Amino acid sequence: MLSFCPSCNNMLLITSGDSGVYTLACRSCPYEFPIEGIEIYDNVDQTKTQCPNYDTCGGESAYFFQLQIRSADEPMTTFYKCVNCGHRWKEN
Amino acid sequence: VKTAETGYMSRRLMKSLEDLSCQYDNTVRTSANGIVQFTYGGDGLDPLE
Amino acid sequence: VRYDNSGCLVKREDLNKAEYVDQYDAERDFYHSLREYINGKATALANL
Amino acid sequence: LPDVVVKGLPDISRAVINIRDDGKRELLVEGYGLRDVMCTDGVIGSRTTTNHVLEVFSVLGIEAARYSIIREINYTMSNHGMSVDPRHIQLLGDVMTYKGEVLGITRFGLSKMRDSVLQLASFEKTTDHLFDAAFYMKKDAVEGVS
Amino acid sequence: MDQENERNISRLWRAFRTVKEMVKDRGYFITQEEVELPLEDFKAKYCDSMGRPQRKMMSFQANPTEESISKFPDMGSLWVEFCDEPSVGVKTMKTFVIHIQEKNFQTGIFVYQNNITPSAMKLVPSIPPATIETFNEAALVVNITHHELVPKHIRLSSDEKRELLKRYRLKESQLPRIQRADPVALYLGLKRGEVVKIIRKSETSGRYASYRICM
Numbered sequence A: 001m002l003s004f005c006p007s008c009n010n011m012l013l014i015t016s017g018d019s020g021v022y023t024l025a026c027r028s029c030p031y032e033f034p035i036e037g038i039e040i041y042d043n044v045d046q047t048k049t050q051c052p053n054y055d056t057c058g059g060e061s062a063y064f065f066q067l068q069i070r071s072a073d074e075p076m077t078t079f080y081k082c083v084n085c086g087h088r089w090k091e092n
Numbered sequence B: 001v002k003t004a005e006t007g008y009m010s011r012r013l014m015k016s017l018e019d020l021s022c023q024y025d026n027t028v029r030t031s032a033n034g035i036v037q038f039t040y041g042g043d044g045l046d047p048l049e
Numbered sequence C: 001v002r003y004d005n006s007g008c009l010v011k012r013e014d015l016n017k018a019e020y021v022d023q024y025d026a027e028r029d030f031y032h033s034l035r036e037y038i039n040g041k042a043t044a045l046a047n048l
Numbered sequence D: 001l002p003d004v005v006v007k008g009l010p011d012i013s014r015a016v017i018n019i020r021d022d023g024k025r026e027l028l029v030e031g032y033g034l035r036d037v038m039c040t041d042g043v044i045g046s047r048t049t050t051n052h053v054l055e056v057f058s059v060l061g062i063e064a065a066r067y068s069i070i071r072e073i074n075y076t077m078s079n080h081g082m083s084v085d086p087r088h089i090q091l092l093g094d095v096m097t098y099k100g101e102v103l104g105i106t107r108f109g110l111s112k113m114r115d116s117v118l119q120l121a122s123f124e125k126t127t128d129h130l131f132d133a134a135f136y137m138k139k140d141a142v143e144g145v146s
Numbered sequence E: 001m002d003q004e005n006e007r008n009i010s011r012l013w014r015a016f017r018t019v020k021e022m023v024k025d026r027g028y029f030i031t032q033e034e035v036e037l038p039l040e041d042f043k044a045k046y047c048d049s050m051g052r053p054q055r056k057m058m059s060f061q062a063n064p065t066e067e068s069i070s071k072f073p074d075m076g077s078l079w080v081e082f083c084d085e086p087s088v089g090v091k092t093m094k095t096f097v098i099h100i101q102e103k104n105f106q107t108g109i110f111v112y113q114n115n116i117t118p119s120a121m122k123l124v125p126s127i128p129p130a131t132i133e134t135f136n137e138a139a140l141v142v143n144i145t146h147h148e149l150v151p152k153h154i155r156l157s158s159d160e161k162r163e164l165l166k167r168y169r170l171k172e173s174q175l176p177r178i179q180r181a182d183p184v185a186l187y188l189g190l191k192r193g194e195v196v197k198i199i200r201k202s203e204t205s206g207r208y209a210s211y212r213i214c215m
């Protein structure tokens, strides 16, 4: 977490406190650190079907797409798109 | 630099295939008289002629 | 001629099938292509 | 933590999607994977190709590997220039493969078939072959040219 | 997960295709409908109504036919069973041996699940009149002989053998060899000293043949 302790100013390492508490203190120097710790580092096509997407939607109209996937004997997978929301959908 | 490298390749490639011939049985055989191939190139015709 | 498998002649059919495949096949195709080449020149005289 | 694999294999260094033939499309992959990416669903594995023939021997083996090694040798040598002819190539790949395993031309791999100690101590070796043949009390014969 | 599970049932289904067409070219008797089925009939047969497939019920039996028992005088029907758990060891292999004991035949073959350990290696290859075979589910998806470069490998009897040696007048062995435990070798289950005729096609004169024995 890369912290430090004023005065001596070396480093702060987490040490296990007795009976339930987790603390941290500077090495070789007396100190105690209370608080919460934190760190962070970083269209023409149309078809007729029922739309599963529901807010007010309940849309009748939809889009579809066709391609052959996986094995030759494996059936066709279709891709549905909705007019109102513009949601992509996929099922075989 | 390429001049010195020229000799090594052909040499080591030779010493493997060095002993081989074609008998009157039309089969190309080795020094141990083991048959590596029944007919040369699957044809038996020489690219020289 | 023809030799089927081991010590047996073939009959009338496998000539086209040719799953037995003895060697000398290079000798047959040479005579074949040579014959059909003359045919191509012969059939050219036909249209002419 | 921000390392470990979520999906895919532990092989490929990278892949590429390229335009195949005239107008068609396909991909080429760099890795040792082979069968696993062939077993990988979504692609037809019937017609494929792979380099470093030795590993092709670990899957298809023998014949198919011999057919592949004469395929690459012919290719790369048909570009830069001249011609080596089809005949001389097939014999090179056959004498390597015929034993049932791909090996040869190197001192570690040149001891496979030949039992002649003098020609092997000729090409490359000095001390070992002379003492080894004496230890095991080998005999062999004087046959070959060298 | 519905997604990845259906990937595996399609795997096993195509894996069932592999072991099927494999038992056919050995000379054993099946039909074109046996190796050819869509996903429909597969889901009915070996998969429950709950949606989860099964294991042990996939086991079947097949025999040879006509020339298979003529060409090769010594042979017969075999018995194939499947595995259960990814962990090997004795377990069901005991009764598997027992199954081979009273039911005789030739070679019990079983497709693995995931891992192999020396436990199951306790005794694999002893049923002294016969033997067995080991196959991994992973390695088996599509057939290798049908793939690209691998040509047709034709196994022949002892008859054709001695005649082939009477052609060029040769002592035995000494021919171009073929290793065993080779994925193609073990595929057809070749024993010691078995010649297999190979028809290969490359372009010079085109089609030509060569012989390779099995060490």
Ligand SMILES: [Zn+2]
Binding pocket: A004, A005, A006, A007, A008, A009, A010, A011, A025, A026, A027, A029, A030, A031
């Ligand atoms: Zn401090």
